[PDB]
Design a binder for this molecule. Structure first.
Ligand SMILES: [Zn+2]
Ligand SMILES: [Zn+2]
Ligand SMILES: [Zn+2]
Lengths: 56, 93, 39, 208, 161, 227, 196, 111, 64, 99
């Protein structure tokens, strides 16, 4: 529903991997993993450029 | 002088929180504006804290003066220091 | 059928068991107690 | 103080011919403007059963025929009714029904269409006099009236829904064909003929 | 009534996949294109106009051509010796051909003058496999095997060269 | 029901099932399909014979041209006013580019009331020569939109004594907006319109009456065809 | 429809509207008058829908002050026509006709294309300015660019339609050029040779 | 609030008479001039609360995505209501709730 | 403050191109067009939103 | 993709009033009606209209891939027949209180 600030409504996963995630928790966890992948694949080029300038 | 009047209502709570006096604000306005503007201020005990002003087609001139006053009247403090926090530092002596 | 824009105005139950109101191995479902009733 | 622009005082002695009215509004010169829906038509002409029967048109397109049938059966009509006393009276198939809540409804046969009235200000009805080039006002149009079907189960609404649903189902513009030969054969044979006549024209021009 | 189990939901999903399949969007879009979009694009600018106020007795002549109907056919293959025959996707794959069909347009010419036309081939459009205009749409399971086509193949692609 | 005989039979069935408005019992028998509310009063739906010869247009004021909004104009013309109900409109067009409408009204309340009473009581063949003078008020810019179909819009007037409802066709819609006259064209403006217009009421000529009857013969030929 | 002026900077917060085939931005009042509604009150009637909201009226006040210089429809259209990126030296009447053309067509084409139908265009302009003011007065968040219900997918159909439109226009231009060349020779062309 | 001209519908700018010492609203496109009722020429709110409760509609009870509570209505004492937070979306906006009854449809707080 | 700008307009008396200079004074609300070859001067009032195209169009209207 | 002409016909049949007959002062509570992003009219009883449109779409009278959106907060009622909209199917729960 609208204006829900409970932990389950905003991305708290109360189950374990052994117990199994619910679909909402599954989607939120996928969002977080996508964030991780984007962050790595975006910061790599900046780090490489900084390393090259330092070496030169 | 001019019939146009300029009065501004200031929040009592934040004015007391900053620990400021109405006379101080009046002296700041008087210093920055010399005698070009006549200023009066309601006392502390007033229900609503107000401070009027009077100039000595000028509606737009008064609007520009009010905008300039709101923009760049510095009451106290170091310019550029937007906010200040108190911190505790653990030091070995 | 509903598209993404029409989804903002509807209320969706996750399972048909959700339409009607202590095991260590079964997953736990949200309470959804913020509202007294759900339509 | 905006001074009046016109002060010449020139006056035209124009006289307008006016005809008596068959009816006169009582208590208020108010009229209600009603938008005509697609499913409703107005037939001011008197109903003539034999030409009506002789002019029924049949089309292959089922949707167009169904729309024509619906608008024809729903058309507002009137006809002369021979009274039992030997006189002639005007008889119509359309009536206006007012419910207890004060709302009005237009009824044709068994079909009933509700009326939604919206108040309109500074809206009047005028009569045009083209031969003199002036407009003579008639009355005031206080309310604008829209006609809405009463319910889903009404036959008019079901026929309209069926016609509009099946109208957009038929969509086929491209027509299939069978190719028996190379499609580029015409181009190459006409290019060969054009090259031949170019050579002949060049030879003739050099020989002319 | 009775309650609806998860198996009923899977029955409904099976009905969905029995009706639509997995590549229905591609085939439906291509069928919409071939059926209406080509005709609408042709009718967007249906009139080319050329005028010539000839004075060489003033005769104002307008020359204009109209575009009419679009005609499509099943894909055909034209050999070097001049013969033609129906093409199938396996032959196009093996011989590096393009699976495409000719497009015909009706051009009507008129000669306007004031003193004061059949099917033309406009090109070949590649055909999406298993669509309404593909040869494999009709073939049943046995002739599909005889045509060396896999029955598990779903279509939704083109064969260029 | 594609049979023409079936369509004709449906037409006569609809014609025969008309409920008499005086029949209170049959009126109460009728029930709203959705509201489930009984009927109170009924009125017959008939066309108008005396007005089909004339041409009717729905005239509306757009925006600030509202008479209610213009308070000094409304006060001058009276706070329904007979002056508004008897106003005159005079379309004058110097050229295709420049066009406007001239509005005239009766400032006096007594003259306007007498003219309105005389106009609304025309049922005999005696009309008094009411030389009414109309005064110019204001000018507005105009635009016109035409109706593709004849009976696109129709205004309904009621008649309680006969339990009928007369409707008239609407040819087009006229919209008016306030026009500010350019100061450089007031010299030509003063030569276009007039400060006063006198209206004289006279009996219609026989030839014009015959022409109007011939026009009405399209609708009603039983009572108006020439012999 | 840009909203110039920063908070407490740049004096007035004017609203200028960018128009197609027009070299410089235009204040909203001038184009509103050009469409054919002069009075300022009716411009505010079109833009705002609740008179008690003094803040949006205050934000529209600089636009009214800037546009007060123009007071007639025809001068507004002429002002549109000067900046219309056309050939220099065009006459005033032709400039006004060019402004009428560039205003009827190419200005919100999805609404309508016919003459005398600009009331809906004025109402839509009021709607756009209302949305701009509602976002500017912190009453609503800015639109989510990444919202998926505001996106569309182009399948084989639309892509092939765009490609075929380009190629058919090229073929039509080739037919036109060949026809122009052939009319020099004055021959009854087969018309099966122009098409490539 | 600002008034408009009654004859040409333009804005009525305030004007001051030197000889008469009066505040008058005058249209600059004509000679019309109407006497002002109040001297409040201009008012600017640095911190404002308008639009917090102004975003209310009369059909908000038909929205199925809104949560439903059992708070007591101050007017008709109904047992069903629909609540939501502030429609203003600045960073300083409070998290207080506005409750709407399903009979009288008025907006009331819990404090 | 007078503003002098070189413009690519065409003089209607000498027919030479790129010899038109626009001089507008916003303080006195005036605009002067001078031909570098013909030495003719055209004066027209200007407003707060004036641009050299406005004075050029005014000159075109005055010429015809 | 679907044509928008039957949608406009249905809307005009069920009491929608065009823009030329619209006064914002008078209509302080009417709902703006958009069709494919084009503001085409207004209405004062949006509940009956959205119920009728949804029932017609569910019966097959309107194409199933047509979008029917009612924004109660902004007082808007939007309809989309555009091409390229991604959709998914869902079960329908009987929400009629009287049932
Ligand atoms: Zn004024
Ligand atoms: Zn209550
Ligand atoms: Zn020169």
């Amino acid at each position: 529903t609208k204006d829900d600030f409970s932990p389950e409504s905003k991305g708290f996963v109360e189950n374990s991997y052994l117990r199994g995630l619910t679909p909402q928790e599954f989607f939120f966890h996928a969002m977080a993993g996508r964030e991780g992948l984007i962050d790595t694949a975006v910061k790599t080029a900046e780090t490489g450029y900084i390393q090259r300038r330092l070496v030169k | 002088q001019s019939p146009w009047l300029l009065r501004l209502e200031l929040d009592r709570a934040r004015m007391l929180d900053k620990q400021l006096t109405m006379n101080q604000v009046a002296d700041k306005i008087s210093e920055v504006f010399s005698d070009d503007l006549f200023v009066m201020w309601s006392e502390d005990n007033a229900d609503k804290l107000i401070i009027r002003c009077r100039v000595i087609e000028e509606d737009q001139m008064l609007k520009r003066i009010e905008a300039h006053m709101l923009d760049l009247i510095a009451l106290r403090g170091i310019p550029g220091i937007s906010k200040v926090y108190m911190v505790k530092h653990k030091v070995s002596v | 059928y509903v598209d993404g824009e029409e989804e903002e105005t509807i209320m969706i139950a996750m399972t048909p068991e959700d339409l009607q109101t202590n095991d260590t191995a079964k997953r736990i479902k949200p309470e959804m107690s913020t509202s007294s009733h759900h339509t | 103080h905006t001074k009046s622009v016109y002060d010449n005082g020139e006056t035209l002695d124009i006289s307008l011919p006016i005809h008596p009215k068959s009816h006169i509004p009582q208590g208020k010169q108010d009229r209600w403007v009603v938008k005509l829906p697609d499913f409703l038509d107005i037939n001011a002409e008197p109903f003539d059963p034999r030409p009506f029967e002789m002019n029924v048109k049949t089309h292959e397109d089922k949707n167009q025929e169904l729309l024509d049938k619906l608008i024809a059966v729903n058309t507002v009509r009137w006809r002369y009714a021979k009274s039992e006393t030997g006189g002639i009276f005007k008889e119509t198939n359309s009536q206006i029904i007012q419910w207890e809540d004060g709302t009005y409804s237009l009824r044709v046969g068994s079909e009933i269409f509700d009326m939604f009235t919206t108040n309109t200000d500074d809206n009047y009805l005028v009569s045009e006099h083209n031969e003199e080039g002036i407009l003579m006002t008639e009355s005031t149009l206080s309310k604008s009236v829209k006609l809405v079907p009463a319910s889903f189960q009404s036959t008019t609404h079901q026929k309209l829904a069926k016609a509009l649903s099946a109208k957009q189902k038929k969509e086929s513009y491209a027509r299939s064909v069978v190719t028996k030969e190379d499609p580029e054969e015409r181009q190459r044979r006409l290019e060969s003929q054009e090259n031949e006549r170019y050579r002949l024209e060049r030879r003739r021009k050099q020989a002319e | 009534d009775d309650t609806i189990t998860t198996e009923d939901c899977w029955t409904v999903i099976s009905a969905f996949f029995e009706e639509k399949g997995l590549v229905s969007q591609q085939l439906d879009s291509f069928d919409e294109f071939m059926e209406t979009s080509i005709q609408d694009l042709v009718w967007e600018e249906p009139r080319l106009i050329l005028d010539q106020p000839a004075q060489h007795d003033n005769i104002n002549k307008r020359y204009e051509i109209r575009f009419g109907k679009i005609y499509l056919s099943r894909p055909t293959m034209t050999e070097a010796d001049g013969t033609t025959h129906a093409m199938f996707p396996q032959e196009a794959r093996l011989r590096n051909l393009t699976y495409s069909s000719p497009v015909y347009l009706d051009m009507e010419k008129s000669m306007f003058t004031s003193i004061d036309g059949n099917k033309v081939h406009i090109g070949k459009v590649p055909i999406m496999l298993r669509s309404k205009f593909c040869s494999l749409r009709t073939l049943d399971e046995v002739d599909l095997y005889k045509m060396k086509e896999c029955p598990y193949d779903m279509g939704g692609y083109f064969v260029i060269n | 029901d594609t049979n023409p005989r079936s369509q004709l039979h449906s037409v006569e069935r609809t014609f025969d099932e008309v409920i008499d408005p005086r029949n209170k019992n049959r009126l109460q028998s009728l029930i709203h399909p959705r509201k489930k509310i009984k009927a109170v009063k009924a009125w017959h739906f008939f066309p108008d014979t005396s007005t089909f010869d004339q041409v009717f247009h729905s005239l509306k004021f757009v925006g600030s041209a509202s008479l209610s909004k213009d308070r000094p104009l409304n006060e001058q013309l009276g706070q329904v006013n007979a002056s508004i109900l008897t106003s005159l409109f005079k379309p004058i067009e110097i050229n295709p580019h420049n066009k406007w409408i001239s509005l005239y009204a009766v400032t006096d309340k007594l003259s306007a009331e007498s003219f309105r009473k005389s106009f609304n009581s025309i049922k005999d063949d005696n009309i008094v020569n009411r030389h009414v003078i109309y005064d110019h008020i204001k000018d507005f810019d105009q635009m016109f939109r035409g109706h593709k179909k004849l009976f696109e819009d129709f205004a309904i007037s009621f008649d309680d004594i006969s339990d009928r409802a007369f409707f008239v066709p609407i040819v087009g819609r006229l919209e008016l907006k306030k026009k500010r006259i350019v100061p450089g064209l007031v010299d030509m403006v003063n030569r276009t319109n007039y400060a006063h217009i006198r209206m004289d009421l006279r009996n219609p000529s026989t030839q014009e009456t015959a022409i109007r009857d011939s026009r009405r013969e399209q609708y009603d030929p039983v009572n108006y065809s020439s012999i | 429809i840009k909203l110039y002026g920063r908070e407490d900077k740049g004096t007035g917060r004017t609203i200028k509207a960018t128009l197609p085939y027009v070299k410089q931005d235009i204040p909203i009042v001038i184009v509103f008058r050009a469409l054919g509604v002069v009075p300022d009150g009716e411009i505010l009637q079109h833009i705002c829908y609740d008179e008690n909201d003094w803040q949006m009226l205050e934000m529209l006040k600089p636009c009214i002050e800037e546009g007060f210089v123009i007071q007639d429809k025809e001068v507004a259209l002429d002002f549109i026509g000067r900046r219309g990126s056309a050939a220099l030296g065009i006459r005033r009447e032709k400039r006004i006709q060019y402004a009428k053309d560039i205003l009827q067509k190419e200005l919100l084409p999805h609404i309508t294309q016919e003459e005398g139908f600009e009331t809906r265009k004025t109402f839509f302009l009021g709607y756009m300015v209302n949305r701009l003011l509602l976002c500017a007065l912190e009453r609503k968040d800015q639109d989510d660019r990444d919202h998926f219900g505001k996106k569309r997918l182009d399948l084989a159909g639309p892509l092939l339609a765009n490609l075929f439109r380009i190629l058919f226009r090229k073929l039509t231009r080739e037919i036109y050029r060949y026809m122009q060349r052939c009319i020099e020779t004055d021959r009854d062309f087969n018309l099966n040779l122009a098409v490539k | 609030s600002f008034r408009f001209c009654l004859e040409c519908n333009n804005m009525l700018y305030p004007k001051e008479d030197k000889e008469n010492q009066r505040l008058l609203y005058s249209c600059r496109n004509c000679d019309y001039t109407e006497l002002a009722e109040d001297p409040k020429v201009y008012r600017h709110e640095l911190i404002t609360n308008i639009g917090e409760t102004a975003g209310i509609v009369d059909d908000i009870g038909q929205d199925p995505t809104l949560p439903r509570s059992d708070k007591e209505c101050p007017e008709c004492h109904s047992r069903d209501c629909v609540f939501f937070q502030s429609q203003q979306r600045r960073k300083d906006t409070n998290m207080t709730l506005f409750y709407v009854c399903l009979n009288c449809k008025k907006t009331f707080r819990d404090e | 403050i007078k503003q002098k700008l070189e413009t690519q307009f065409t003089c209607l008396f000498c027919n030479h191109d790129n010899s038109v200079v626009c001089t507008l004074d916003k303080k006195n609300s005036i605009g002067l067009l001078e031909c570098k070859k013909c030495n003719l001067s055209f004066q027209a009032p200007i407003n707060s939103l004036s641009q050299p195209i406005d004075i050029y169009s005014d000159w075109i209207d005055a010429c015809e | 993709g679907s044509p928008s002409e039957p949608i406009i016909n249905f809307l005009e049949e069920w009491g929608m009033e065009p823009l030329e007959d619209y006064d914002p002062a008078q209509h302080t509570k009417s709902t703006r009606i958009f069709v494919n992003g084009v503001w085409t009219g207004i209405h004062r009883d949006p509940s009956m209209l959205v119920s009728t449109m949804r029932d017609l779409r569910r019966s097959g009278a309107i194409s199933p891939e047509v979008s029917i959106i009612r924004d109660i907060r902004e007082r808007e009622f939007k309809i989309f027949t555009d091409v390229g909209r991604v959709y998914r199917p869902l079960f329908i729960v009987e929400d009629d209180e009287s049932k």
